Amino acid sequence: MTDQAFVTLTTNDAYAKGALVLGSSLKQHRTSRRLAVLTTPQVSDTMRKALEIVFDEVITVDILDSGDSAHLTLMKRPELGVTLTKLHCWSLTQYSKCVFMDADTLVLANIDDLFEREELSAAPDPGWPDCFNSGVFVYQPSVETYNQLLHVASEQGSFDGGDQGLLNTFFNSWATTDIRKHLPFIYNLSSISIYSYLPAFKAFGANAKVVHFLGQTKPWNYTYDTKTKSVRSDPTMTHPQFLNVWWDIFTTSVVPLLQQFGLV
Amino acid sequence: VPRGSHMTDQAFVTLTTNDAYAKGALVLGSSLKQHRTSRRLAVLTTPQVSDTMRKALEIVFDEVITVDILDSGDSAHLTLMKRPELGVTLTKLHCWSLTQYSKCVFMDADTLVLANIDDLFEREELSAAPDPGWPDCFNSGVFVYQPSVETYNQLLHVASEQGSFDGGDQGLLNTFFNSWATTDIRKHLPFIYNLSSISIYSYLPAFKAFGANAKVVHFLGQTKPWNYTYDTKTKSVRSMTHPQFLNVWWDIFTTSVVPLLQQFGLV
């Protein structure tokens, strides 16, 4: 379709890269939907033009601007900057339904079938499995839902200072209702469970469809030996296995593009 | 004594592979009673549990079934032969052979009840909570089931054919009841019935947010409660949720178990 898309957020040039790899992986796996990305003033004009190459739409969001819907809220709760910025994904009404994906995720296979789910379908969080991990979720853009969330943010904020805490306080029926809204863990694999319940990973990690590099060091901070074709830190574990797929894509599909803007 | 209806067809089953866990079994049951459960308390024991300790169990628990898979006559035996690493696993599965019950809630000895959980009996065959590791597998630490010799033989076969993907019972029980993750949300016990003592510090915020309601604690991981050192005077263990819990465990072990234990041997 063209009224259905993948939305991601890029708060700056660092993540901007993850955004580039994300989209690239999405394309590489032949998605038929659109690729939109929300950017903030913090992303360099140059980098921003590279995004325009990979993504179909490049919406700019600046909650610091007094004119922005979220602004007044940011005032009340300053710690929710990135959170309110991400929520703008709900304001992209030019789409009927979208699948949001943080820039620190990676697609390992076609996931277009996620568009079969309805408002707030996400996978569980390895931490407290009765909360969904806001790293990958399917939603219906709606200005109301947007204002809805905004209010909640203002009234009670995030129980964890992030968007996952807000999004979970709002869509608080996910854990106990409609199993169809429970995305399989492999649509969002957290790169800790791939070594935490290691056996489980060795068992089903193979099917992994989306990887979520959450935690301390993001993929773009590892060091990649282009010659040996792997990262620093043999490795028959989940994570590297993945970190290498990320770098293969960054090197093969992004760098070139980046170099042309003299960004690399 | 107002003693409300006593379910004698539904019970809480736990396993004690030896004297160490035997203590956890004692604390478990005790917490269960302390929180006024109306069901029965059964416990499966193996030859490894001392005759003495075994008699203490008979004080706290209603039934004390003895399971010895090494015995050539035991149903599991032939399977243990095929897969030796599944000893404890096949021993725990015997919980399904306790047909004197219509429905039971199983709980590993390294768990602790912080509140009445008798309402777990409202669920059906294989309801459990998710595992903090790979949340699409249920943590076999606390689950509700219907004893059935068939279901038992069912599992036994699976064990023999493909074994456990993680060498434990949770791997087998998840390979069998493999519909849990994507079917019947009513069979998804809330994390607070099977809380793991890592998420209480792992997604620390989340704990600080809902850990308060915690109904059952699951001391999984390296050091079991019975291996910590408790200062009876200061009333706490050696080196906030977690200790918070380890202390409740020790308060119960000291207040309700020790006495019972002391009056025999090994105080």
Domains and CATH numbers, chain B: 1-267 (3.90.550.10)
Cβ of B190 within 8 Å of Cβ of A197? The answer is: no
Cβ-based contacts under 8 A for chains A and B: 95
* CB-CB contact of B138 with B131 (8 Å): yes
- What are A115's two structure tokens? 């568009």
DSSP state string for B86-154: GHHHHHHGGGGG-TT-SEEEEE-TTEEE-S--GGGGGS-SSEEEEPSSSTTSEEEEEEEE---HHHHHH
φ/ψ bin of A256: left (φ > 0), alpha (ψ from -120 to 50), beta (otherwise): alpha
B206–A175 CB contact, under 8 Å: no
Decide if B266 touches A, using CB distance below 8 A. Answer: no
The residue type found at B49 is V
Q: What technique determined this structure?
A: X-ray
d(CA A44, CA A42): 6
CA distance A6 to A87: 14
Question: Is A128 within 8 Å of B132 when comparing Cβ atoms?
Answer: yes
Strand B138-145 and strand B103-107: the pairing is antiparallel
Helix ranges (H only) for A88-234 are 143-156, 163-170, 193-196, 198-204
- Whether A196 and chain B come into contact, CB under 8 Å, resolves to yes
Resolution (Å) of this entry = 3.4
Measure the CA dihedral A208/A177/B32/B87, to 10°.
-30
Cα→Cα distances B119→A179, B43, B116, B185, B264, Å = 22, 20, 8, 16, 35
The annotation status of B224 as a binding-site residue, yes or no, is yes
CA–CA distance, A171 with A148 (Å, rounded to integer): 11
Determine whether the interchain pair A176/B190 forms a contact, defined as Cβ–Cβ distance below 8 Å.
yes
Closest to A199 (Cβ–Cβ): which among B129, B171, B205?
B171
Confirm or deny that B79 is annotated as ligand binding: no
Q: Which two tokens stand for residue A53?
A: 């190459």
A215 touching chain B per CB within 8 A: no
Between residues 107 and 166 of chain A, which touch chain B (CB distance below 8 Å)? Answer: 123-131, 159-161, 165
Residue B73 contacts A where some CB pair is shorter than 8 Å: no
What the block records as the tokens of A237 is 């574990």
Give the residue among B174, B177, B159 at the shortest CA–CA distance from B79: B159
For B175, how many CA atoms within 13 A lie in the half-sphere containing its CB? 23
Grouping H, G, I as helix, E, B as strand and the rest as coil, residue A7 is strand
Residue B122, token pair as written in the block: 């409202």
